[PDB]
């Protein structure tokens, strides 16, 4: 007498013991491609991925026999739901064929694009190697403007039709997935509907995020109002005193990150800045030392040290020319105990923080590996990189560095140093939140059909003017495609991970720090040598996605919701100082300032 439940558990047992290794082979082939790029290795990696893909779909069709309602409780229930939603078999074969060509076409278009000087057609620049350096570093108004307009124009115009086709096909694909609109599909990841009637709904995500933006808008408004006064000195006649900033001047190609505006807007220039790169180099520190110190930090709280498999197996340094590699840092959860970190590490402060951050990814993977195979993907899209940013935050503090030996004890930490530090932090952390929110809301809305094709650009900039306070230097009609210009947009990637990515680090830091009985300001928090924080954190990590993410969050912070209170508390000192400096200057945007309309 086997209840349909009881059978389903047997099926999943079979799935776990068969699929674990097969997934392993796909992970290993992909890893081999990244660490030894060659066309043969590409073909092998794709072939293994094809084996895993076909197997997964066969398991989906077998999985459909056990129906969720008859299933009782509770991760096994959840496991089946992941299994049933195959993934791609919904779009007509012909439409699938058009879609893949469209997707790869846009990906290549973005990667292949290059821009020439107007009077110098022979001189050409690429964004990823060359324009990034121009956009971050330049002080010249006109050069920055030409690069921005050229990139958005030359690449964009080619993409403005393909995105239109991509929207329709993706919308049909989602409507076939019983996920209306497709923007709706992306927000699927958060919602935990099976919470006994109290489940998160995917439509609710928009409501929560909007509330977040209004809650965050005061800090963003003051930060911007301060920045525009600082920028005005550098470009005297090109920024309007009451108007929104032009898009190009924000410190990178689209304005996502304002960290490159830190030198322009530094509050206290003479006070000494914090870089331990030279101290790192002068001390004979190698990449192995960087990661060993990292592992030691995780050891202090009570989390396990790296596996033997981790050390011998990861690519932490660029090989040189044993091979060519992708230089981007990536954290791997390959499978059965192969946990690897891949980085082209350099002995710099940036790579030290990034290494500490990546090891957090590994620690998450390692902790929740015990849970069943399908429930090993963090807790929501935003949990993972969030955890990493928490570990980077605790380590970056000066107090930790003095104990490390990278900073002389005789660094005076006064009013000025910390406020300045928080400003750089605000440009990266707070600056991107309205950009990310606005970009997404645009994608979600377009998928909804709330925006007609012929108003895309118009509406895009309206939102950017109203929500982000960034303005176009030159009018853009309805043949250019600016939203696609961002990498995450051009290659179908959900961008809301970054907005919530923040709402997490702090809500979590605040707690962990409170648990460690840290007596002091929030931003100076260091949780090192506090096992108790390690255990609370360990309890969250081990669960993974077994539980609904609401409950997992509640165990750490005694709450089931995204709260930006901690973020604002992190930035409150900078917040007050900002109010003091902005008394004599205008705060807020007027929605319609344009440089061209004189």
């Amino acid at each position: 007498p086997s209840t349909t439940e009881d059978r389903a558990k047997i099926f999943l047992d079979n799935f776990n013991h068969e699929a674990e290794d097969l997934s392993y082979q796909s992970s290993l082939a992909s890893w081999e491609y990244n660490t030894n790029i060659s066309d043969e290795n590409v073909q092998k990696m794709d072939e293994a991925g094809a084996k895993w893909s076909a197997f997964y779909e066969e398991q989906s069709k077998l999985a459909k026999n056990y129906p969720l309602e008859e299933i009782q409780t509770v991760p096994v229930k959840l496991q089946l739901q992941i299994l049933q939603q195959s993934g791609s078999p919904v779009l007509s074969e012909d439409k699938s064929k058009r879609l893949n060509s469209i997707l790869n076409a846009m990906s290549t278009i973005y990667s292949t694009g290059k821009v020439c000087k107007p009077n110098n057609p022979q001189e050409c620049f690429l964004l990823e190697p060359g324009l990034d350096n121009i956009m971050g570093t330049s002080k010249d108004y006109n050069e920055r403007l030409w690069a921005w307009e050229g990139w958005r124009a030359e690449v964009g115009k080619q993409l403005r039709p393909l995105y239109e086709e991509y929207v329709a096909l993706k919308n049909e694909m989602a409507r076939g997935y019983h996920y209306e609109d497709y923007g709706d599909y992306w927000r699927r990841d958060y919602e935990t509907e099976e919470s006994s009637g109290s489940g998160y709904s995917r439509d609710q995500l928009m409501k929560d995020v909007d509330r977040i933006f209004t809650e965050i808008k005061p800090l963003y408004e003051h930060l911007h109002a301060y920045v525009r006064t600082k920028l005005m000195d550098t470009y005297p006649f090109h920024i309007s005193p009451t108007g929104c900033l032009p898009a190009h001047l924000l410190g990178d190609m689209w304005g996502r990150f304002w960290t490159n505006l830190y030198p322009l807007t530094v509050p206290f220039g003479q006070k000494p800045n914090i870089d331990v790169t030279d101290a790192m180099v002068n001390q004979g520190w190698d990449a192995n030392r960087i990661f060993k110190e990292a592992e030691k930090f995780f050891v202090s709280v009570g989390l396990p040290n790296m596996t033997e498999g981790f050390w011998n197996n990861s690519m932490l340094t660029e090989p040189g020319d044993g091979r060519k590699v992708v230089c981007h840092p990536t954290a791997w959860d390959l499978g059965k105990g192969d946990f690897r970190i891949k980085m082209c590490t350099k002995v710099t402060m940036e790579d030290f923080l990034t290494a500490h951050h990546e090891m957090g990814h590994i620690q998450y993977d390692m902790a929740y590996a015990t849970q069943p195979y399908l429930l090993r993907n963090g807790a929501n899209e935003g949990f993972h990189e969030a955890v990493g940013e928490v570990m980077s935050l605790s380590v970056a503090t000066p107090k930790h560095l003095k104990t490390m030996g990278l900073l002389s004890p005789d660094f005076l930490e006064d009013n000025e140093t910390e406020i300045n530090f928080l400003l750089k932090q605000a440009l990266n952390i707070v600056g991107t939140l309205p950009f990310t929110y606005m970009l997404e809301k645009w994608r979600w809305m377009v998928f909804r059909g709330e925006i007609p094709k012929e108003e895309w650009m118009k509406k895009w900039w309206e939102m950017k003017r109203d929500l982000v306070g960034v303005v176009e230097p030159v009018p853009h009609d309805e043949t250019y495609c600016d939203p696609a210009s961002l990498f995450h947009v051009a290659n179908d990637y959900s961008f809301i991970r970054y907005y919530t990515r923040t709402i997490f680090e702090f809500q979590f830091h605040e707690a962990l720090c409170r648990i460690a009985q840290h007596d002091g300001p929030l931003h100076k928090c260091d949780i090192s040598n506090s096992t108790d924080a390690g255990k609370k954190l360990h309890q969250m990590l081990s669960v993974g996605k077994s539980q609904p993410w609401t409950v997992t969050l509640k165990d750490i912070v005694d709450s089931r919701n995204m709260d930006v209170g901690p973020l604002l508390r992190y930035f409150e000192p900078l917040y007050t100082w900002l109010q003091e400096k902005n008394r004599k200057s205008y705060v807020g945007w007027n929605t319609d300032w344009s440089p061209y309309a004189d």
């Binding site: 086997s2 059978r7 047997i10 099926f11 047992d13 079979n14 013991h17 068969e18 674990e20 290794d21 392993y24 082979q25 290993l28 077998l62 026999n65 596996t307 033997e308 498999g309 197996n313 390959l334 499978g335 059965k336 105990g337 192969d338 946990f339």
Partner: protein, 196 residues
């Protein structure tokens, strides 16, 4: 004084998969137990029976050696009263166990790049194994109401599954080799001796 031939059991270059575990009977030797512990290369060498130092003097009726290969995580199942997929369905020691269990990491020779799928285990069974029972049945298992048509299909699963062993795997998923000694005394006079 026929020095026991344990070396052939422990130093053997081929070990059988866990479900088809080999019993290598050892009779009429003098057996030195000191050498096993003083070799001291083993990851796991606990006698639950009596202390190995203390059993050198004791003389046994018959001594059987059980050898097989399993995952690292599964090593903890090779103990009395422990339960799991290995102990329930492959090799189950008795609750009243009085012997040594030895295990070591096999990664060097038992795992090859691309996978050594030659090791097998029993995933499904109608009833849990009795102590020291070996089941090599290849009969298809019917999870659900529908019967085995004698053929693999929906809700008819093949009982045996291949261990996937690879060099890069984690210490837990690394293949380990196991050797179990079992000790028995009977009314007939005991002859499997040690240094009494």
């Amino acid at each position: 004084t026929n020095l026991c031939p344990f070396g052939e059991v422990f130093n053997a270059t081929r070990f059988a998969s866990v479900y088809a575990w080999n019993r290598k009977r050892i009779s009429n030797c003098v057996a030195d137990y000191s050498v096993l512990y003083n070799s001291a290369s083993f990851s796991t060498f606990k006698c639950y029976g009596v202390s190995p130092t203390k059993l050198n003097d004791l003389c046994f009726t018959n001594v059987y050696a059980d050898s097989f290969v399993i995952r690292g995580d599964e090593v903890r199942q090779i103990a009395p009263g422990q339960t799991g997929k290995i102990a329930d369905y492959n090799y189950k020691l008795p609750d009243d166990f009085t012997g040594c269990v030895i295990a070591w990491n096999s990664n060097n020779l038992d795992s090859k790049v691309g996978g050594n799928y030659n090791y097998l285990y029993r995933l499904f069974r109608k009833s849990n194994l009795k102590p020291f029972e070996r089941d090599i049945s290849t009969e298809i298992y019917q999870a659900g109401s529908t019967p085995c048509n004698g053929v693999e299909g929906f809700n008819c699963y093949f009982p045996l599954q291949s261990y996937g062993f690879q060099p890069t795997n984690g210490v837990g998923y690394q293949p380990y080799r196991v050797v179990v000694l079992s000790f028995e005394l009977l009314h007939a006079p005991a002859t499997v001796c040690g240094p009494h």
